[PDB]
Structure 1
């Protein structure tokens, strides 16, 4: 149906906008702390601590399968990146501090992304 197609075109356009959001958020992580999944070879206990791991590569795979239906879904995954890191790592660590900075800087980007998603529809 044409209605199915139009819905598909909206998903595609949201996918475009979320790719640009993703790039901008990932630029706020120049150390690449959040670029890849935590390795279970190098942190064997990780899944005892963190039940839903997340990273920018895993978000990028979901994005390219058009797997985010709305901004809320995408933000949930972003927040997992930050929130997981801030539980596993102590306050005095470079990891925790990097999460804080990504959160604070990413807030700005997400604030305008929400306006654009609502505005364009």
Structure 2
């Protein structure tokens, strides 16, 4: 149907916008602390602590499968990165501190992407 096509084109454009958002968020993590999943070889007990792991590579796979239906779903995954880190790691660690900075600096990027998604429909 012509309707399924137009829907598909909207999803493609949402994907294009979220890709740019993701690149901007990932630049706020220059140390690459959140680039890849926490290694279960190196932290064998991680899943006893964190029930829903998340990282920027796993978000990127989901993105390119057009697996995000809206900005809210994307933000949920971004928030998991930060919130998992802040529970697993103590306050006085390079890891926790990096999460706090990513959170604070991402807020600006997400503030405007919420307006661009409402604006462009």
**What is the CA distance between 1:120 and its match in structure 2?**
0.3
Computed over aligned residues only, the root mean square deviation of the Cα atoms, in angstroms, reads: 0.2
Alpha-carbon distance between aligned partners in 2 of 1:65 and 1:94, rounded to the nearest angstrom: 32
**What is the CA distance between 1:92 and its match in structure 2?**
0.1
Structure 2 unaligned residues grouped into runs of 5+: none
The answer to whether residue 31 in structure 2 is matched with residue 31 in structure 1 is yes
Alpha-carbon distance between aligned partners in 2 of 1:2 and 1:50, rounded to the nearest angstrom: 43
Structure 1 unaligned residues grouped into runs of 5+: none
TM-score, length of structure 2 as denominator length: 1.00
Alpha-carbon distance between aligned partners in 1 of 2:4 and 2:118, rounded to the nearest angstrom: 21
Alpha-carbon distance between aligned partners in 1 of 2:93 and 2:40, rounded to the nearest angstrom: 20
Describe how 1:84-95 pairs up with structure 2 within 5 A: 84-95=84-95
Runs of 4+ in 1 over 4 A off after TM superposition: none
**What is the CA distance between 1:47 and its match in structure 2?**
0.1
**What is the CA distance between 1:8 and its match in structure 2?**
0.3
**What is the CA distance between 1:75 and its match in structure 2?**
0.1
**What is the CA distance between 1:12 and its match in structure 2?**
0.2
